[PDB]
Write a protein that binds this ligand. Sequence first.
Ligand code: NAG
Lengths: 496, 146
Amino acid sequence: LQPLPPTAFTPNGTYLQHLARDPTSGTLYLGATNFLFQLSPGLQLEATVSTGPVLDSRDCLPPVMPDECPQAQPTNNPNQLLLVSPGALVVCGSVHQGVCEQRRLGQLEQLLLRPERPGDTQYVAANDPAVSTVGLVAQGLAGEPLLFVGRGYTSGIPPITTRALWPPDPQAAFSYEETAKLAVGRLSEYSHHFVSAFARGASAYFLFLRRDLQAQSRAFRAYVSRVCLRDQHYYSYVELPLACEGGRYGLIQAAAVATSREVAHGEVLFAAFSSAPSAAAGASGASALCAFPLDEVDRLANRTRDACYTREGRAEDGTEVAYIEYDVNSDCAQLPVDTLDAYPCGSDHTPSPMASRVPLEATPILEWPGIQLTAVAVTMEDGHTIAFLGDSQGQLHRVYLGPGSDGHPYSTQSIQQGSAVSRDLTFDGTFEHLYVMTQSTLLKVPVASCAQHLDCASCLAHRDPYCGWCVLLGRCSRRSECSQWLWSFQPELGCL
Amino acid sequence: CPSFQRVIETLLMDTPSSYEAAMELFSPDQDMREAGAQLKKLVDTLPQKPRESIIKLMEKIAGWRPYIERWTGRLIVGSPSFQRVIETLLMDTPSSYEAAMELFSPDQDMREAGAQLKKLVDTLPQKPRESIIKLMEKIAQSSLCN
Ligand SMILES: *[C@@H]1O[C@H](CO)[C@@H](O)[C@H](O)[C@H]1NC(C)=O
């Protein structure tokens, strides 16, 4: 049982698509239809920017000119990508073939970088609001910021590109070089659908669905793929199928690593999956949370790279575990063991792009029927890992993932009934609030509300791992506030 | 998880073929195969009654559900008790392995039996023991036991 959120932001006359937090300042940036918003941590506006609508047509290339593109009409610009970078906000709409721009952090109304005459290596985001775009900011071997972009197919732009944010010639911004791409023949048939991008260590990782054209089924399947964070070709690119309860929950929806004061980015990816590209809606559907240690992702990908480079795609027992994907003219090789160290990210003579026949397997930490999860955040309190999970019906569930749990949520709260929770769920600086976003509103939700129980008995009855009874203070609180504390989740003592 | 326990039945009183085949069904790594072989040769040197008493201990132990360990953020698929038996046998002191057995109330026979196993396992090198750990973690997430 949870109170009404204390703070809301709701834009008049528009829908929300993305949220980005600047951790230096805590400033929130909101990408909406025809809008960009800059918000204080208390969800008060600092800046509003109009991004639309614009004269446009998907059959025309920008600049869109009336006398030159007669069928262009005003076109609404829902936001496709919103990312904080070392010196700029990166902004991509769906209008004008997905071109991007860069704006000043803390002064959103100030344009910093925008190519005036973009070419066809600078069409970044999906120019269809139905289709999803994901990105990742990272640094190249020289410190130059790079934009990794995961772009689903629109009714021929590489599904994954590595684009330069600060090229020395400013007119080249957001373009990828010839080889800084995943070259895929049949885009429309693979039909990538991207869910998230994240960096860890020396690699960039993508989570997506795509048809398994290699197998007989040609079914949509979940993948994690990994590429060297500075290999500005895709020599190191390797794909792994993702199995949650062996593929019963086939469609990956959202994912996050643990984030808290104790660790800014944990080592365990918590992915939400749904049974089946959309999940079954209503009672028929079911969702699962599967945890994958990133070190397991890296071992399977390593083994896959090692088999393809040095054993013609074979595991040590002679079984066929790695192959070349996307119909690219390339084969697994028997290169000298030497090349594993020489070329950790590959070269122009190493097999590419690689994939595993062997999936990464995980057992659900929760199976929930009739719930379609759409959003995952994970944090830690007094050492306990807690998951915050949003669903398609606008519900936020809080879940204890520690030992002894059975996967039931210890709290469910209605946020905006019927409106999917955005996967751009993220915490504030102190991990005291969750920023929950739907298509309609941005709410600032306190991770717990122990103070609402004024008596020991009610404090302990309403079980919540954040909360316990502080005897000397006589309050219901988090442990950290209790300057003897009876944990409501498992109380050492009673009130008498 | 039947298919895991005949991995255990065959480790302790059956042929290396039947053991290797009980292990192979879990699609093990190659690091797990050499380390599974090194352990089997040590389990072979044990006289029969130690192994028979070990099987009763091993199967008396024999619940699995994934959780995240407190403070560490670690993923364990198993039970804290089982994890404790796993790590004290393969990576900690004989005394700590002993106390982990005492959770399951063994009799003097299983005690002295398990103590021989622990004495033996400690002769393995570091990395094979670690592989045997990654092997039991593999078994729990296998879509065999579920
Ligand atoms: C994967 O291989 C890379 C380079 O070969 C190495 O740096 C890394 O430690 C490996 N990771 C795992 C989990 O094996």
